[PDB]
């Protein structure tokens, strides 16, 4: 009846559903084709069919309603919307549209939208009056996103260390710097679990670029939110498309006074896709990266801000360093001081089998007075006073044993004042 | 009526202003487009429209009146000035021009300047006789810009230390050397507050390059 | 069959000559219409002629007119084409009063050498050009009009000052794109606009 649940159902249920409807030879076809075949057979029955998706306005004028299940990939089951709907209902890219759809008539291969009754989880009339994201005035982060989980076991202290290293708030534009094989993949998993548990209201989005297929499955099964990704086999034009879709969708949610958190991975890989797709403008910098090529990722990364009117957009990205590629290090140079939060991971700490491998001295956040209270903020200052003299390799080891014997970070603070 | 106050007004007031004038679908557009749409609808009414901006002469010959609200960024609401105005009124880049503007005729997308009645906050005739900046003879600083504020609390002593460390005067060309995360961002804030408070007459300009939003 | 539907659809007198009729009949019909049209013009009356087709008409004149000893390419005599040019060139706007408008269709790419040479003589003889593209027609997109090639001469008098310049900016954005997709661009844009006036303001929006 509704396209939303058909994609969520496994392929096995779809095969059984299609067989009783009279369809045949469905197991050997793709999942997208099965959905189209099932809808087509149900469409001619006469019962109304609903749908949902994310609008993607093309340069021609007509758009499509991509689905987050397929990672916003074009497919036969995508809903086609004529430019007339964009006229009557003023819509932009990334808008969420849910409504009745009509069967495709001969001469067209895509379903068409009949009527719109829900735009961005709101009435269509109210969505027309929402202020644009650009017109919103950015501000510093005010409310802190707690990272410590009470149910979290003492085996993994990554969540607790992040609170001591660099607190994160709504609208933060933090950047993660880490060499390869430094544990950055599961570092975001701890952040995703903490955000989902401590702040269920916040919308969590995980974006993966050039990630292995196995990595995508575990992220979807672990993160309590919609996760989109693009495998390495997909062309470069697909990687940029996924990134553009997520940021546009995130901006629309911000306009509705809603908080959305994006865990980008990785900014270095994302800039590679933009460099390839964007044609050369005649100016080539070191490493073969065009100056105009890096303009797009900066605008995407810089969109993170705290809106004074309401809502916030928090973007956390991982930067790859010491990867052996000249093109990778030059990108990190452009994104050096562009973030208000720095989280540096050390390779030499990681090889010592001590986790989390966080360089406490280098990592930090800017304007942390607003995030933390008066007492909590000054308790971190004295902690940094005793961690700075010691080496970074043993600095993490010092915190690991101290945090192990303390149930919570509050107990750790009073212990430090004891000596 | 005047472009100067339209930019200062928030976006919410602009939406309400446009709706009663008959405009529709303004919330989803940029602020610059809203100003252009509001001016266009008001232009056809018949009432005169004023404007203000900073001249930016291009290499072709024609200039534009950029606005400080948009950080001198090119936009649809920028006022276009033909080279004829630069001829009759000898103007250079950075000049402040305020005067009546005309609605854009078809085939052009920018407003045009009708007449000039204020150049650099002065009569246009007097502005033509001003001596060029290069011809002026430089000199050492004479009058000191006081940095200590009486209303300043004892919590922040940055203003007082600057007086003891290195006094600053009019025409000074000081340079600040500081490593990253050394408190230089709010160091200028204390200077800006002291200059604005102690010397309200002085024109204060803050320029930021590659700064976070 | 084509004749019957034209008579039943056109709100005016329609004359035609079937293919079975001899060549001497085709010229007779053409001469009768132009002579009748000229007389109406003399009475300060406006007459519009939709000729179809000028290529076929020249074939009839070539057959009936005896050879004068000079044969051009394709077997068309120079004096043979003199008559259709005078018939086609009779269209004009009379200063005293009335007008005579003649619109004719020229056949090209018909596979006949005689057809293409006739079009060469009638290339720059008209003040209005309306070229249709075969490749647009096979795409099942109509009308299959080559916007870039089609045009009119001295259009300032026909249109107003505002309307004329609104077409210039339209041609400024249609020229860069290909002719095959140029018509497709106009079809969708005109579909969402009730009238051409609404189409003009939409273009200025972007
Ligand atoms: N908090 C942690 N606790 C235990 N092991 C960790 C932790 N973080 C990383 N690791 C180790 O790192 C390895 C995975 O690293 P990975 O996340 O793939 O790095 P990268 O993403 O840079 O390739 C695992 O084998 C795991 O043992
Ligand atoms: N006069 C001051 N009083 C108190 N704190 C200060 C002062 N100047 C700088 N700071 C500290 O510096 C931090 C901000 O540094 P910042 O100006 O961002 O340095 P940079 O501009 O080099 O990055 C704040 O957290 C603040 O606590
Ligand atoms: Mg990884
Ligand atoms: Mg700074």
Curated annotation (Swiss-Prot), chain B:
Description of how the protein assembles with itself and partners: Homohexamer. The homohexamer assembles into an open ring structure.
Record organism: Escherichia coli (strain K12)
Coiled coil: none
Chain's gene name: rho
GO CC terms in record: cytosol; membrane
RNA-binding 1 as annotated region, ranges: 61-66, 78-80, 108-110
Name recorded for this polypeptide: Transcription termination factor Rho
Regulation of protein activity: ATPase activity is inhibited by bicyclomycin and dihydrobicyclomycin.
E.C. number(s) listed in UniProt: 3.6.4.-
Swiss-Prot record, chain C:
Function (record text): Facilitates transcription termination by a mechanism that involves Rho binding to the nascent RNA, activation of Rho's RNA-dependent ATPase activity, and release of the mRNA from the DNA template. RNA-dependent NTPase which utilizes all four ribonucleoside triphosphates as substrates.
Species this chain originates from: Escherichia coli (strain K12)
RNA-binding 2 (site feature) positions: 113
Gene: rho
Subunit structure: Homohexamer. The homohexamer assembles into an open ring structure.
Location of the region described as RNA-binding 2 in the Swiss-Prot/TrEMBL record: 71-75
Domain remark text: Each subunit has two RNA-binding sites, one at the surface of the hexameric ring, and one at the center of the open ring structure, where RNA helicase activity is thought to take place.
Domain of life: Bacteria
Coiled-coil annotated residue ranges, if any: none
Family that this chain belongs to: Belongs to the Rho family.
Protein name per UniProt: Transcription termination factor Rho
């Amino acid at each position: 009846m509704n396209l939303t649940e058909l994609k969520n159902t496994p392929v096995s249920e779809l095969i059984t559903l299609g067989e009783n409807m009279g369809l045949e030879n469905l197991a050997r076809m793709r999942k997208q084709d099965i959905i189209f075949a099932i809808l087509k057979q149900h469409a001619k029955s006469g019962e109304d069919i609903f749908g949902d998706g994310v609008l993607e306005i093309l340069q021609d004028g007509f758009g499509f309603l991509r689905s987050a299940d397929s990672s916003y990939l074009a497919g036969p089951d995508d809903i086609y919307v004529s430019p007339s709907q964009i006229r009557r209902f003023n819509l932009r890219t990334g808008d969420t549209i849910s409504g009745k759809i009509r069967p495709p008539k001969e001469g067209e291969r895509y379903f068409a939208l009949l009527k719109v009754n829900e735009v961005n989880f709101d009435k269509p009339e109210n969505a027309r009056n929402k202020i644009l994201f650009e017109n919103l005035t950015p501000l510093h982060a005010n409310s802190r996103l707690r990272m410590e989980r009470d149910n979290g076991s003492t085996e993994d202290l990554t969540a607790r260390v992040l609170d001591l290293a660099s607190p994160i708030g709504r609208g933060q534009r933090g950047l993660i710097v880490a060499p390869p094989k430094a544990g950055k993949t599961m570092l975001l998993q701890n952040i995703a679990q903490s955000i989902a548990y401590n702040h269920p209201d916040c919308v969590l989005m995980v974006l993966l670029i050039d990630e292995r297929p196995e990595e995508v499955t575990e992220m979807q099964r672990l993160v309590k939110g919609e996760v989109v990704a693009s495998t390495f086999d997909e062309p470069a034009s697909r990687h940029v498309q996924v990134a553009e879709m997520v940021i546009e969708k995130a901006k629309r949610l911000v306009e509705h006074k809603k908080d959305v958190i994006i865990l980008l991975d990785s900014i270095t890989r994302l800039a590679r896709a933009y460099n390839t797709v964007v044609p050369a403008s005649g100016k080539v910098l070191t490493g073969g990266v065009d100056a105009n090529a890096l303009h797009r990722p900066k605008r995407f990364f810089g969109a993170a801000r705290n809106v004074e009117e309401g809502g916030s957009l928090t973007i956390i990205a991982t930067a790859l360093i010491d990867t052996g590629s000249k093109m990778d290090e030059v990108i990190y140079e452009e994104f050096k001081g562009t973030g208000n939060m720095e989280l540096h991971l050390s390779r030499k700490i990681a090889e010592k089998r001590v986790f989390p491998a966080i360089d406490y001295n280098r990592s930090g956040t800017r304007k942390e007075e607003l995030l933390t209270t008066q007492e909590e903020l000054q308790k971190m200052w004295i902690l940094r006073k005793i961690i700075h003299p010691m080496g970074e390799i043993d600095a993490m080891e010092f915190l690991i044993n101290k945090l192990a014997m303390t149930k919570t970070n509050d107990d750790f603070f009073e212990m430090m004042k004891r000596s």
